[model samples]
Target: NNLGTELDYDTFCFYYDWYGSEAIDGQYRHWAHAIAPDPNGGSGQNPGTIPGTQESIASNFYPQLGRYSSSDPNILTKHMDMFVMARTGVLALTWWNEQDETEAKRIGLILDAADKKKIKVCFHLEPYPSRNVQNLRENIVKLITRYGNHPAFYRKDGKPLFFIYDSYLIEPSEWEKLLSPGGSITIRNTAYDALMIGLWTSSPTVQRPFILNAHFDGFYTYFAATGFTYGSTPTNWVSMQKWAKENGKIFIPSVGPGYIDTRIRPWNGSVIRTRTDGQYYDAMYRKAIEAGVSAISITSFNQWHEGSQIEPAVPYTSSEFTYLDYENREPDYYLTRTAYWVGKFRESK
Candidate 1:
């Protein structure tokens, strides 16, 4: 009833991906993720950028911050504090690796900054470098031991939240070994246990088996495009919600302002979802609210390559590209609009 306070709707989550930049780490990474050929080939996503130049980066839209880094405390605070304006309470920060060696140090700062804004920080787990159950087990253990106690680390009750992107990549039986009760390497009821949200990228009939058999607590559709997947299609949300309730699964439908990444992947235009003066966003949220669930995930705060960012964007022109904007609307128009819909959501509950 009170917007998931009685249910699992408390995770009013906004997905944020930390970007790497030559300006901070002294090496270009995410900004360079779409360029054609490079010897370093960034984890196999296109990789080549003209060193530190903004024009050489790969995103379809330019960020208001210019080519920035998450490592800067000032920039990090700026990003987290804005969530306050949108009434979005949680930050599902993307976690590529399970180790604390690199991202760990920087992540603590992100947590600390989020604390200032009274925002919750959870892990958006990515499948990386041979993500097997063994590696994942180690990762869960190390993560909890390291940052479990932080004020910013988000948990419902005592267990932390983890959204596993593309979790279907691993076989359900393999995950069951870690998720199911009494299975080999099981983390159920252990101090390392977490509320795992797997990606539901297929039709319910096709994806439900994966969620139930894998022992995941819930599933979410992370894509922003309307009908890209059965799960992401807004019209299917209610039907899925009923199935989720009957099965005791959490169904978090992801909403986004829009989608377009043609600059990075020219062939992907067929799937682009237009922003349409923010009408598309309201449409997505309205459908999610009608699903009668409390929790809804935002597709992204900033994933420039996909043009799914709600982060402030300015109309920009570099010799090669002229990025899109909110047209006549202000730069922060989407954030303001999020607050508007968030109000509607609370009323629906």
Candidate 2:
């Protein structure tokens, strides 16, 4: 079995777009947050001071893109190629709102690129300001009307799929009003009918009520660093899967290569999990498969800021900061390993 074989279950990778290149600007908008020099001479809690550059950012891992623009066609093609090789069917795009033209245009390009490879795109709706019931209904209608028919938009049971990040930010009753079949603005029978998945955090007591009332099709834990939260811990996969199965909901466990947000949140060093030459990733993947999940998810394809990216990262050292690289391995090490696990996942299925 290998990636060349077709898979039965769906696999998705979370994609971010906070970085930019010289094409956009040498100082990409999001890099500043990661590369900002500490005012206390780089000796305080956030003990790193490095200027943001195309070749460098304040992260433990470096991307092959080197702060590339998300709108770059070549980069988009390469990303799609990698996902295809990894046997991932869907790209869960981070979408804040419908207002940003730049992000919207980039989404168009990604949709076109992914569609060519027969890949699907689903929206990971971020909780923007005042993201209430009415606005969410309008947004769903807008998205379906605009790109629902696109070849790239991901669908389940003939309806588009949406992953609502930080869904707990919105009250369960509010979500019920929008998603539940009996609610006032229910999308169950409308054109906007879609599979909406909510984010489930570590706290079961806090998350369960929301899932019960929100009427979402599924729930997922998005963080890569396992021990950081109980929901993300590998040990909980089997029970969580069982819970989901018993509740008649989908369970999607998100796995990642590793996690290290020291550059961005230096005070959070206690949560760092090393890649360990892919052993860490293999463990998560193995657990996810054993749990008999309905689908699997990667924490991220390329979210370098938090070092959760499974995308190819290269060895690099800046004047004051050095990023982790694929030591004693090829740049596509994680990608290849992902393909292997995907093959195994399909075989077991």
Candidate 3:
């Protein structure tokens, strides 16, 4: 039953159409932000626009709430279930923009982050070992104790899995203190599994080796519907795989189909393929599996900003996502191909 063809999946499936820019009418845009002084906008003046209003904010920063407005629990549930079924046991869910919070809606929203809304929800916070010590610790305990044994929660052997966004932010002393938790403390990488590598260590950490180290070199795969040519290179793969093996540290390598940022950069980045032909994706999957990656992390299931996403939605959608033809409901073209390879990978491994 341990199928090699299995692909670890990001949780926020179909997020772009709903979270970033509207791909369809009446949808939500989860990570949309209010227009700030454009990082590129320098000290220029505008047409005397006021600073705040829901509409102004929506038009400016971008909304990060919902895209299609289909926030119905049932609707979210059905779509996510479909995604889980598509990948089955091979899929490890990694929800995007996961955070710790007390809001019920926030919990509900993140549970849907991976698009596999059926799986139990687990929250990950930008790890701050030094500041907010009590709150961080409290939330960690709450999440672990609350969803520790949930089917979808991340884990190692038997311990519940936890992650820190900025390991560097965790001072070494704070890190030592934090890892002292009763449950497992996975340092970095993979949303559904534990990784122990320290922050900023490019190669797997030897000082305090983690079970594995994940590279954040693939953004296009999740949001762009395609992949960039210069992904984790063969050399990068070979070096990492060899290092982890030599150190006896597990290595998780990520792969992507492609990426883009329709809202932010106005499509400055390549779309990888811009089309869901899946030709390039299959090739990349084979590459990752062949490289002897112990665990495979798909770039993302949903991230409308930096593009790489497998969530089903239209491309280059628009401010309001009024594009009806952009609607799509299938494993991304390349993802479908990789799904087949994942089956092969499991069998081969």
Candidate 4:
């Protein structure tokens, strides 16, 4: 049984001191460790601001910077070592996913038979409307050609898959042109036969007819369970899936445990920290998996900003985690429950 209880604010800092360090680097292996590569690209090249991805896991206690060698000819070895520990099969690399000669060489050096098979590389492309599809496709095609030969390229349904993070960025007409008359594109060795885009809004409704045209392979429904905004609930999911089928669109149902955007901005608004009770989360996870979702994007493995991280960080003197207590839940209650069900479900699968 899970005891949902609340804790005093002072306990958080104490808890932080204990479990915090565990989420960084070596500990950033779980799905909970995943974070948007924010703050990293920002001006603070050194340690001023926490890079979105690294913030949750990194702290002052560790060698926070300047460890890797982008210039060293042997940088690939270092990357490989870290990659091996990360054990993440998929890498959602950033936009402008271009690789310079040095980067290309490094990637080639690190990529190996086993590593390639284990690490599938994918990039987040800006939405369609933001830029010209024709020009974008040309640039994208060049990138595909450059790295397609690499073994780490991502594949979907056995073919390489490219995804647009924001579907609405591309206008309906422009999108049509790229997928249709602009002619077929052959990206990498597999060919750009399909697109896996993130769909977040209910607007234009054209998303369905747009995808129906045979240009896109499918859609990764995206982070709908992250916010408390109008359409962020699970209830909205079933309808969207149903609409996808009715409209001849392939919808890949997505589920997120919860979200917190407070990391970057101190004044960021209220957060939605869902309980980690095994049954509730289990139901959510199973809901997505049972829906035939090709894959599940756990709300977060470790997005500390909104405080929705999941990696075991430290001393763990108590069983309670971040949200349950604040919401007046018991400590240790979710730990046992969540573990049992997740383990069972995973083994069964």
Candidate 5:
């Protein structure tokens, strides 16, 4: 009896902070300021204007931790607990190249925690500067050699699963050099090769062609606002899934609670989507399951910066800002709702 859908599932979340007191030396120097001039508040860290306190940060919603560190084991445990409760088996960790020491180190702890709690972890490869076929190969090798053996490293059909973000940044011809079966740098049959899924956006009406041309195993939408992008829109899922099936490819539709990042991109209010006390999340999940996708992914587990996170958020207020919260409900309202939806998804399957 699977808690969520019997098919594989994943959730995306970023974890690149080092703000806790126990973090390594210089770790605290890398994160957002506790209080500073908001970049969107008509000032960019300059004096003479109102300073943005931690309460406002740069997101529409605030985390329970108030911009906490990901390096903390307690935070990791709590996150794992929430995912387990939600019955989402996989956590797609956002990652840069192999040289990001903080992320690499934190991954070990995350993997350790996830493994202990029976949760799985996958990689969401972020676009880095000069990300070419050669660099990608090296990164894949590093991931496999270093973390592949871990129990928490997600494996699908005996192969590691990877979601490459902004894969279109590199041209299809270049992607072919690495993803195509017969190309010089092909990883298709290699030990370092994994089940690669590419990111698909709305503007590119040729997403299907691009996936096929690039030789990716499948595609997924990362945005949370349902209709904000054609790819993320629920109405497009069934057709996309049917096409995927016809083409012998996988379709992993993403569902999220909602979306809003106006604090970071002040001019981007058009993308905001109301949560509606879980109705929005429910509709997204319902559509994903109804589409009969081979697998489904949550847009995020904890992307607080984008307000797409399902992580527990507490209501807070500051002199200049009042962040959203799960008012009239427990702090774990979203987490609890996720579990309910997971059960519903399982029943649907």
Candidate 6:
């Protein structure tokens, strides 16, 4: 299925959370995250609810599907359907190393599902416990050798793309050992070579030690919220893009509808960015386009906890709490909005 490898420019990639629940494991997993009370930290009226229930889960916007197992084939198929609906050609899956047997096995299933729809699946490599340079090298070899040949495995310029989330945890000197050419155990010129994209956490005003020293092929802004971090902030994209061109690197800017994780951190209202009836999304997309990005990644397709999801959500109410809805917008409103931005990206200067 590795047909003519043409550059799929302006591709819109969506962050996908695949560890929602597990029926066979008999656990709610992330869906059961505790919901904090409004003014949960400051006010003495209430503390917060632990052992979160289905109706009172940790998210302002409730998913239409409720709490469902991601391991299910039907759910996987449904996600592909939704991706098509959103006109998103890629899904950046949250993944760790091959150590997690359950998560590793699920990848094959996801790739097959994506293959049917011709959608690409890239790895958003999570910083698993003590993810140092040694393990990263081993994992990269094992990861690519196993899945690189897959038709649906997302690649750029004939190399698979691996987004290293929070890569600063490991020092730049250590990364050089693995990424830099001729370094010990370097992946360059090897089958494991890939477009390794690292998280850019430093401010645009200053050059971080890693971007130039380390051998990352590109950088990305992962967080959905603006102004929370320099990299996440939308306006910074233009300057970052300018920097990338001078250094010959790719800059992928992530856009999101909004940010509201009060369910998880009730005292964090100061960080929340309201959707403002799709205006927030439009604004973020406009900045990304102005910066001139070849690829744009959505903060999430179903990151409900952060309220960054573009996934369809239904109006929900229970005795415990009345879950927030999209507020007069259609359930799939963001899906359409996503395609809208993708179009503008192609049309822009």
lDDT of each: 0.81, 0.82, 0.42, 0.42, 0.75, 0.79
Candidate 5: regions farther than 4 A off: 1-54, 203-205
Off by over 4 Å in 6: 1-14, 18-22, 34-52
lDDT score for candidate 3 against the true structure:
0.42
- TM-score per prediction, in order, is 0.91, 0.92, 0.62, 0.57, 0.88, 0.91
As a whole number from 0 to 100, the lDDT of residue 338 in candidate 3 is: 47
Residue-by-residue lDDT tens digits, candidate 4, 195-302: 545445553255556565535545655452433532245555566567666655555544444444543433333554454543445566566545543344433323
lDDT by residue for model 6 over 1-349, one digit each (tens)?
Answer: 3332322334646565544565543676676665555653455655545344676676788888778666767778988887777768888888866467667668888888988988888888898888988888888787788988899888777888888898888888888988899778798998888888888987754445578788888888888899888898887788889889888888888888999988787778888998988999999988999898777888988887889999889998987778777887898998888877776776663
Across residues 1-349, which tens digit of lDDT does each residue of candidate 1 receive? 4452221235455554456777677766677664444334446654334343677556777778878887878888888766776778888888889454557778888899988878888888898899988898898888888888888888877888888998988999999999999779999979898988999998767798989999999889999999998889999999989999999988888999999977666667777998999999999999999998758888778888888888888888778677788787788888778878777787786
For residue 116, give model 3's deviation from the true position in Å.
Answer: 10
RMSD of 2: 3.0
The per-residue C-alpha lDDT of model 2 at residue 211 equals 94
- The regions of model 2 sitting more than 4 angstroms off are 1-3, 7-9, 34-50
List the pairs of residues colliding in candidate 6: none
lDDT (10s digit) by residue, model 2, range 182-241: 999999998889988888886678777779899999988898998777779888889888
Worst 10 residues of 4 by lDDT: 8-17
lDDT ranking of the models: 2, 1, 6, 5, 4, 3
- Tens-digit per-residue lDDT, 1-349, candidate 3: 5544333433222232233224432323444343334455567734232222223222212222224333455545644554554452223333233343324353444455433543433333444334443455566565656655545555545444333344444455444434433224432332332333332233334423332222221111121232222224534455666655775555555555555453444425344344345544566667667777655555555543554555454333344442211224233443455456656556546
TM-score of 4: 0.57
- RMSD per candidate (Å) reads 4.1, 3.0, 7.6, 11.1, 3.6, 3.8
